[PDB]
Amino acid sequence: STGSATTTPIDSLDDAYITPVQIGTPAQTLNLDFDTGSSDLWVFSSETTASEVDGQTIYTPSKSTTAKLLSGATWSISYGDGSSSSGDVYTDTVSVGGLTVTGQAVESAKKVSSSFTEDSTIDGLLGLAFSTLNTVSPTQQKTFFDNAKASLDSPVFTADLGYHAPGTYNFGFIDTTAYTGSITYTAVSTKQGFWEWTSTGYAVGSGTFKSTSIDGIADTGTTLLYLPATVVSAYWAQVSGAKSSSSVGGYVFPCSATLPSFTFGVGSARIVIPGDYIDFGPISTGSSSCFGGIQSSAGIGINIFGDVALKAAFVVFNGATTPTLGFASK
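and the corresponding structure tokens:
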């Protein structure tokens, strides 16, 4: 089997992407944030504290003839950005772009933190990291991809995120028309539960490539590119007037600037992030100070190849017995 679904930016900045997901019978379609940095499929629901729901579409398990309470199971998750959610668990039928999994754990939120409430466009998350990170207790549950894998034509999914435009998540096949040149594959460590890999270096603008190993995670659920402070300083030094602002929370730059591109290495291959992808706009409405899309990972504890990086590539998440990651230009 295969599936193919369009993923759509939630706003004009590509702060996140939502993908429609069918849950239950009859289908209830919710727009979920596909997140290769976590491993829980959780949704706003009829069980979510009413004051914490503000415009989201909810899953109502009592209206699904295939929903079953997973007795005794609870979940609770905290994300790198400080947000969180928790609740109980149902199993139900879940379909993405024509690919159906029966008996998928659907984690129903009883509580969500303010950042979720305040984002009316995201109805929940669909985790695509390794199932070892799944938070369901006392019986850990499998991700949608893990459940689908054996039925797929090939045990892979691909992320093709758009810049200021829709893109695509495919399951079970590689669309050879969706990228240019060849796909370069690189090793993955699953030791921390992430799609963790090592970039071979970077360049700023038209500058020379610096060969250096940068360990990090491919994370569709993180907006920006978080890299070591040395790398980030080298990038922003090429933007007149750019500076790190402790008050704002990262590097800012004059909105009048033209940003240089940023290149990262994948083996001997190179992925070029255009300068415009690194612009996250005014820090507040009407400001001439703009927020940068490349930020320091210092104090996160891990480097994160988030959407800023991934949207410059066609990315293969290869879930074969020994997982690997593939990157192509597009």
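(Above: one complete record from the training split.) The longest strand covers residues 99-112.
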